[model samples]
Target: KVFGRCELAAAMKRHGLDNYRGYSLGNWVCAAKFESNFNTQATNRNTDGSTDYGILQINSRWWCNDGRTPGSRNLCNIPCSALLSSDITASVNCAKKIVSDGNGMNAWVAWRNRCKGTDVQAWIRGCRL
Candidate 1:
């Protein structure tokens, strides 16, 4: 599922991402734009042999277990496949865990590079939260 800008914003907010870890909904929306373009099935293989999964591109090495990545911590305690589902509940929950674990949104390089220190509210412009 490829979410439209406002669609993603609404979903994220409904799932308690609005101000999780002191980051606004736009921060998540902005990062998803760069990380996977709001596509639920998006995946990217890292040079370290781990894969990123789902809209937020949660990493296999630290977050989800792909059963292939070496030394996977599986901190989210879910299979990587869960992140790929059109049902984004798992993805959103795992993302929350990532922030709760003290990584903040910076766990995603896309967020750090594109959303950090910027007026991320623009990412949700015209969307009624």
Candidate 2:
């Protein structure tokens, strides 16, 4: 489930999309869940220790650029990535830009396409709060 109406609204504006299709943030959250289980602290390396990052799974190296600095999408261990800056918003915006340009969430298309037709109310608020 989404954390708040304000945050959701901010994401909508930032990504410039209307998953509402009529009335909902289901589509967006669905994408998030499928990507990182909505876990802001998620991290995975590419077997080469090259791209360890946050929950949304962005590579820390991509942004850090320093040789020794670790690659990450900006998620802390206890507070969660969403508790950090608006990095997730930025990632979603990045995905949205790709989708808008017909790239369809770019690298994230596989998840988006797969989850598009399934029931996502659990991610939408079926948790009821």
Candidate 3:
């Protein structure tokens, strides 16, 4: 479900994202905040003629199929709509693979540009998770 910051942080922790695949929960929380504001169904068009979908903003060019774009490698092998689900299971699962396919959290430009080298622990502040 689309969540406020606290709920999103807790959910990510419960889902084992606190440090899954070598990236920290702080980094993920930081990314979710800047990328989609913790919204599960978020989408945005990019200057690269690609669209980003879901909370971590997985791209249409490399990650998932939006169908509006053709010949998408769909490296994560899921429909883009799957990432937009309230459930978030598919989105998180696919996101793990994206990180694996690249250099950790660098898979997300939002994380690199907005979240990197900042005091990101505040993103999870007040959340007991």
Candidate 4:
């Protein structure tokens, strides 16, 4: 499922993304906009042969095991397929794990390049969170 902007914001907030690890809800929302355009099933393969999965584009190299990412750490202890679901609970949980592991939101290049240090409030504007 593809989420509308505000719809994604509300859903993310409900899952405890707001102010998670000192990152604002808009930061997460902005990263999702660039990473997957809010599509639950988005996937992208990297040149290194690892793939990124789901809305937040969690990588197969270290986060989720795709069973094919050669030497995957599987730190999230989840199959990459689990991230493709519209439920998003697993995705949100994995994202929190990524941040809590000391990577911060910068784990996503999309966030570093676009959302970092920006006034992202517009991403959640009118969302009634």
Candidate 5:
């Protein structure tokens, strides 16, 4: 949705992600910032030939189809392009399922690299909760 930081936080909280699935709002917003910079349409090709889609960077390998790749598990039952849109509802839902399957935010390299064990407070600095 190309959201600003505060807007993203507010939207996320409104969607019940404040502590959804045991992850904090700060963590989700922080991961989204590092992964896609609040760009709902972000896409990245991975070295392994799979692509990451959407703000949470859900993978085509297991989550959705890029349409070019055949035999993807497509477990999220969504088109990969669906992730690349202004609506984050589907992405957030898929992310919840991803965490439920284990790995938590560790599923996102950006979270592990940028947010894990760091002072994530500033990701929401100056924003009203």
Candidate 6:
């Protein structure tokens, strides 16, 4: 599974890339683009929110205490869990588990870049988040 290169930009932005890598509001907003095309109304039936709510598209019925966690602000630095529970909107567990790998952030950025679809695989190499 680890035989090839991977991108981690998205993951970095999610947590503290901004702190270390000069993260900005425009960068933070990309998570929405990647997960739900920035559409708050976007819903993934696969997650159904009522059953297996996860990250950006999380549904609260099963993802948390009726959908909103009380400690999202405090739990940003915690590690994720192998066993996913609710609180997908924000959580220590979600943080640790929701990594985008190596150059994933490159892809996230490429969504808006003219460089998109133009040698994407090679573009990610050294591409900053």
TM-score of each model, in listed order: 0.96, 0.49, 0.90, 0.96, 0.90, 0.28
Q: For residues 48-68, what per-residue lDDT tens digits would candidate 2 score against the true structure?
A: 544433324444343322133
lDDT of 3 by residue, 1-129 (tens): 567777778778877787888767888888888888888889998777778999988888878988776558898899998989887677787788787787588788889999899877788888878
Candidate 4 lDDT tens digits, 1-129? 998778889999999999999888999998888789999899998888899999899999889989999879988889999989897887888899899888989999888988887878889998877
- Model 5 residue pairs with clashes: none
- For model 5 the local lDDT of residue 47 reads 76
Deviation (Å) of 62 in candidate 6: 7.6
Error of 1 at 2 (Å): 0.7
> lDDT per prediction?
0.91, 0.45, 0.82, 0.89, 0.82, 0.33
Please give the RMSD to the true structure for each candidate, in Å: 0.9, 7.1, 1.6, 0.9, 1.6, 12.2
In model 1, state the lDDT of residue 81: 97
Model 1 segments more than 4 A misplaced: none
For candidate 5, the per-residue lDDT at 75 reads 80
Output the better candidate (2/5) by TM-score. Answer: 5
Against the true structure, candidate 6 reaches a TM-score of 0.28
lDDT of 2 at 90: 50
User: Residue 5 deviation, candidate 5, in Å?
Assistant: 1.3
Segments in model 3 whose C-alpha atoms lie over 4 Å from true places:
none
| Model 5 lDDT tens row, 94-120 | 777788777689888898899888766
Task: Show where candidate 6 strays beyond 4 Å.
Answer: 1-23, 47-55, 59-63, 66-129
Per-residue lDDT of model 1, residues 42-108, tens digit only: 9998889999999999999999999999989999999999999886788899999998888989999
Best by lDDT: 1
Each model's number of backbone clashes? Answer: 0, 4, 1, 0, 0, 16
- Residue 114's C-alpha lDDT in candidate 1? 90
